[PDB]
Amino acid sequence: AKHVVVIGGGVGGIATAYNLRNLMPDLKITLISDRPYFGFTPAFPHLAMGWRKFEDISVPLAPLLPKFNIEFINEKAESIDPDANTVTTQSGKKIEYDYLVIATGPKLVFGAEGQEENSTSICTAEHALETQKKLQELYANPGPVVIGAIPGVSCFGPAYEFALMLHYELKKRGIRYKVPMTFITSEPYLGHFGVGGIGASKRLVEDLFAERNIDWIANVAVKAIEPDKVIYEDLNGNTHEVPAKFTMFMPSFQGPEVVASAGDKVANPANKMVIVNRCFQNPTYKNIFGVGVVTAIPPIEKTPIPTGVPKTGMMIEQMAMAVAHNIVNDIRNNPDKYAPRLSAICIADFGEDAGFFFADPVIPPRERVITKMGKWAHYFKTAFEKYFLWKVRNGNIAPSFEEKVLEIFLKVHPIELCKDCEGAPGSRC
Amino acid sequence: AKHVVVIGGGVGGIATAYNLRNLMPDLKITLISDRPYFGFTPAFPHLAMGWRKFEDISVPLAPLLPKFNIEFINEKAESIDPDANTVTTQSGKKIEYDYLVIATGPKLVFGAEGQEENSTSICTAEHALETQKKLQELYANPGPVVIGAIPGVSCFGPAYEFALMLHYELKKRGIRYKVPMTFITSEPYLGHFGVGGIGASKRLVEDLFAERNIDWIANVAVKAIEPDKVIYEDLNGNTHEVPAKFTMFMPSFQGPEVVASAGDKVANPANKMVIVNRCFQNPTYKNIFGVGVVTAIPPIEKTPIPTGVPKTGMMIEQMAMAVAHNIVNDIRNNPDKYAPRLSAICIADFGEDAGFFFADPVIPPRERVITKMGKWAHYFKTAFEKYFLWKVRNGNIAPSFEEKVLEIFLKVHPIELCKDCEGAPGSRC
Amino acid sequence: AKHVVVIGGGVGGIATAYNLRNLMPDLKITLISDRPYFGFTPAFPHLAMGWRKFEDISVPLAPLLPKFNIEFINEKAESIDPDANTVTTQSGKKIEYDYLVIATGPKLVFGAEGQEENSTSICTAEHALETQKKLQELYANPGPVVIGAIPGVSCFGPAYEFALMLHYELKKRGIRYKVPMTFITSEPYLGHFGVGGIGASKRLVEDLFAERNIDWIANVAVKAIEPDKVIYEDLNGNTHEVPAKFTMFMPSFQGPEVVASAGDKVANPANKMVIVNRCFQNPTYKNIFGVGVVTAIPPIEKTPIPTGVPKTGMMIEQMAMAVAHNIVNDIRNNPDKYAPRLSAICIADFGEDAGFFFADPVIPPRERVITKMGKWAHYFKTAFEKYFLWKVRNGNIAPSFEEKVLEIFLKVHPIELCKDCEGAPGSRC
Ligand SMILES: Cc1cc2nc3c(=O)[nH]c(=O)nc-3n(C[C@H](O)[C@H](O)[C@H](O)COP(=O)(O)OP(=O)(O)OC[C@H]3O[C@@H](n4cnc5c(N)ncnc54)[C@H](O)[C@@H]3O)c2cc1CS
Ligand SMILES: Cc1cc2nc3c(=O)[nH]c(=O)nc-3n(C[C@H](O)[C@H](O)[C@H](O)COP(=O)(O)OP(=O)(O)OC[C@H]3O[C@@H](n4cnc5c(N)ncnc54)[C@H](O)[C@@H]3O)c2cc1CS
Ligand SMILES: Cc1cc2nc3c(=O)[nH]c(=O)nc-3n(C[C@H](O)[C@H](O)[C@H](O)COP(=O)(O)OP(=O)(O)OC[C@H]3O[C@@H](n4cnc5c(N)ncnc54)[C@H](O)[C@@H]3O)c2cc1CS
Ligand SMILES: CCCCCCCCCCCCO[C@@H]1O[C@H](CO)[C@@H](O[C@H]2O[C@H](CO)[C@@H](O)[C@H](O)[C@H]2O)[C@H](O)[C@H]1O
Ligand SMILES: CCCCCCCCCCCCO[C@@H]1O[C@H](CO)[C@@H](O[C@H]2O[C@H](CO)[C@@H](O)[C@H](O)[C@H]2O)[C@H](O)[C@H]1O
């Protein structure tokens, strides 16, 4: 039987591994990850707020994967030799492969001066639990809060989420009137999201921030985060400072060193992310595939302050479907190749209500969008959390009824037959 | 009996002639037009989209007009000698008049370099049909679309209609995701219309364009249209390019050579349109009147990129009522004279829904506005098309019941008794 | 028997005296005011429009105050001696105090050239009644109207009310299509109000002005008001003019000479307003307190054209409660001290409909806001008019049920226990 190695035990890796296992019972699958657990990333802001226990939004992998006949190597992957078809781990183990799926997620860059030491973040479970400790210090003696995104950021949604959630928590403890709140972004306007807006999302986010007294500055570059202030710069080259006792900023993403260790035909020279085509396949090494945030996708828009394109859960699940069909078809000498649609349903949780965004596809021109807001969306978010964690524990990330439901309600088709893969990911075949 | 000559068989000419015939059965009336049909201009964008047949939106004049005792001459009117009270047609035929109504409509100016050769337009039935043929090539080989208005345009609505109708068509064909759309206009902002806006039209159109993925650039001057790009200049004097496979631009308007031949007391030197007062009568030759787009009306505001005032269907019908009454009162020695109210009910059809704009009067200060959008407004537009074509065929463009219904629903009165005609058209007596 | 003197028979003065009386029946209380009446300021725009009679919105104080054991002296206070605990009136009466409350309202500055002589205002009942006279001149001979605020203004609401009420009047008279209207403000944008906005107030007023054809110019400095034009200067320092037969502008505010007569420890050396701390107490003379418009509160933000913070009715009522309690506790050897919450409910009346604005606190960061518009709000303003006048005539500006009702509907509490008064008014202890 053939052998697939998957690097990374997160959303993209588990989904590709499970898709492969369900398509092909006797295929060999080995997953390598530095963390012994799968963590449900959409719940990290909630964890930082103290609204979750770590144990409730994570799944230990060692006792779980052998039930679905998948081998788990709890180690970090160190280098890739693509001519030799090998991955080497931190202890020195060499695993040979027929196909490689790289799904290592973000490598975080705290690009602002003093960001790593003076600020907080919520991108990992470990960073989130440390943010929670800083919040208890805030509640005890309130002060100015500033949240947002530095230049180069491509994941803007959790910043908006955390701000609105923190507003809600401060308000429930009756202390919001003692805490200034300011939001600062590299986005040219609020609700850009690195996608050029989704419908009238600019008007909607502006209205929401006004109603909930969150001040904002957009189309600027955050340059320094000090223990007592945040410094940013505008398009004229003028510098400005804003007071701050507690901060939470999004880092920007680059590719990891394990990817860089491969050629310049695999690691993008500008950012170290995986070079992929429409079919999420490396153009030069055809048995290497990219899934998730680690993939190199061109910006939708060249903004005055540089921003990038998000890779959301629904996009990543479509990547995982396409890639898994592409590997299985290659094994069987079926010439049909699939591109993911790259549409997205995103919910931004605000506390007891939430924003609902749908874009089809995410990269314009679009066939359609939906932008709505209500309490119903918050309960749908909590419900999807419980469903997705069930899916991880039961060994199927893509049950048939789910695709049918998204087709009934939203006219979504997750993957398309692609006649020519050669082009940037997101371009149409 | 007395003799009135009407030049032009369109909205303004038919309405004045019919108004005159019903006011005075004994009056001799001659209508001169270069086209053998009346064409319903508001259905031209729909003709361009292939949603109408020409025969369904036009009425032949020669077998019809004699039934209402109106003499039809199917020739171009070539010159006017206002001192001899004579009109001279292209074949040399000389027709003496007691009163003259000029209603020749717009003379089209394709002012951007290469516009007439490389672009399309929808202002005449013949141009609309040419546009339909070019759209066929766009559906077969999809590319970037740019639509809009060059400098000096005074009719913006049909450009907004066309853009939204095309978006609808592309979605019904399931190929909108393959076609970038950009809107480029001389207006200082979207929803200006050459009237400084109608209520919150700017916010309405901005939200509509964002919801339906129509990109836009306002407050610029389109300089050139090539086979492959559109070239515009900004207010800093810097030039830009946008890629373009299919384009549709509005031309600007001037007046005709028949008006120019009457001298500078009748022809406005700056634009060749008919010099008229408040009563739509010529100041120096008082047996000459102007009705419709050919009348010289000042812009409502001086915009950074030059723009002019629309003459809409409701405004022109009001011009026709006022003019017919003024002539008939002269014959009878009744010193009463009338100015049109110049209010407008406009519907921009977007395919399956539409925007409804009401302004009373169009030229500020206004008494009231209404700006709405829904499915209902689309069905009203179709309904009115049928109604207006019926009126042309049945010899009465102003049935009494219509004025009464407009009074009880929107509080409009079509004409006002004017104490002093001596002033610009649109200014208050 | 302890003795407190109150200067000013307005909102702040009446409210502080009544609070003190109800807290301590055996306290000696003297109120000094130059006007013999209480004037319900919120109905001055209505008075200027001719929609009220002066007698319906005022309360003579001489026969009223004795009823609640309050000594009334109808004289202007001219000097204060803080070291001697004395107040000197215009005649020459020296009044000794144990505690002093300064509440003399706004002292008006007509900063624009020709403003006092050529424009109109509505800040006093005298000015309001004179404005009504000029409005009759306008109806007789229609012409261009301009309304707004000059640099330094801190009270913007009444100018917005007046513009819309006047539009409404003209509409009922059927002459609005003959009257251009322009609103010119020192605010950086419409709906700033000197508070940095209340929810989406900017969007609301912008749409309102569009629907009702009121033109506007923001972020500029009105320099001159002439009999036929209004002159302003923009941020680039360029001069402009606008035609005008009728105008109404807000003047800016400073402190009175009676405050200046005390030390530069009492009078703010920039604007002459009363120097207070968080508990609305003077830092150096601890038996001196300030209430209402006369208190010196820093601007919420420094705007391009200078602008200041309003003191609305509800804000002033809470200042009065805190000050009354702070005096009583000092007498009773109770160390506890109180700061006002400074929340506000403001209704801007437009004629037949109105805008409802709620901000808690007015000075940010805020716990919550509400912005609404409808017919109900107009009837609400009329209802509060009747209710407040009743309270003045009945000796209790703070009946216990009102607090409970504000609590159950808006979650408002009027005052807070303050562990440290030492800081700027409106800052958090
Ligand atoms: C904070 C946060 C919130 C968040 N919320 C989202 C949401 O509400 N909806 C939504 O659609 N998307 C949200 N996203 C984005 C996205 O869904 C997440 O970023 C995903 O987690 C990304 O999926 P990936 O598979 O790309 O990354 P991963 O982090 O889940 O997993 C990577 C795994 O790889 C391991 N690893 C790293 N390096 C390794 C090496 N060298 N060797 C072996 N293994 C390696 C790593 O441990 C992990 O298991 C949201 C996104 C965010 C984040 S800022
Ligand atoms: C494309 C387009 C759409 C459009 N839609 C409108 C709408 O939805 N509502 C509305 O209220 N108005 C709309 N208008 C504008 C306006 O109503 C039309 O332009 C009217 O047709 C203008 O009426 P006129 O009477 O001014 O002109 P006409 O074109 O109808 O007819 C003039 C006649 O005169 C003839 N003629 C020209 N030169 C002659 C000489 N030398 N001798 C004799 N006769 C001559 C000509 O053939 C014609 O019969 C909309 C407007 C548009 C347009 S871009
Ligand atoms: C035109 C206008 C409308 C207006 N509308 C308001 C509204 O709808 N809601 C709201 O909440 N607030 C509104 N305000 C603001 C505010 O509530 C008013 O300005 C109050 O009237 C202010 O209260 P104050 O106590 O600060 O001032 P006052 O004018 O009521 O009373 C001052 C009294 O003192 C007398 N006086 C002056 N100088 C004296 C000396 N030297 N010695 C003795 N007495 C002196 C004076 O005669 C008066 O009795 C609105 C505000 C406006 C106005 S621009
Ligand atoms: C496992 C697969 C999951 C598939 C999920 C499919 C997603 C499709 C949902 C998007 C469609 C729009 O979603 C729908 O929008 C309307 C608004 O028009 C929402 O809102 C409506 O319901 C709530 C009920 O409390 C009302 O208060 C609200 O006034 C009303 O407008 C619906 O509650 C929501 O369900
Ligand atoms: C020849 C004579 C010409 C007659 C003149 C015609 C007068 C024009 C009247 C326009 C006034 C607005 O017209 C009216 O607006 C309301 C909006 O509140 C619309 O109401 C619409 O919006 C609501 C929004 O909740 C929808 O749920 C509803 O299905 C829809 O009907 C009416 O469908 C429309 O008829």
Ligand SMILES: CCCCCCCCCCCCO[C@@H]1O[C@H](CO)[C@@H](O[C@H]2O[C@H](CO)[C@@H](O)[C@H](O)[C@H]2O)[C@H](O)[C@H]1O
């Ligand atoms: C004794 C002191 C007085 C205590 C102060 C009372 C607190 C006031 C609370 C106001 C905040 C709630 O604001 C509430 O919003 C809704 C939403 O449109 C308003 O409007 C609603 O009622 C009106 C009543 O005719 C309807 O015409 C309208 O269509 C409906 O929407 C309510 O009239 C208003 O009461």
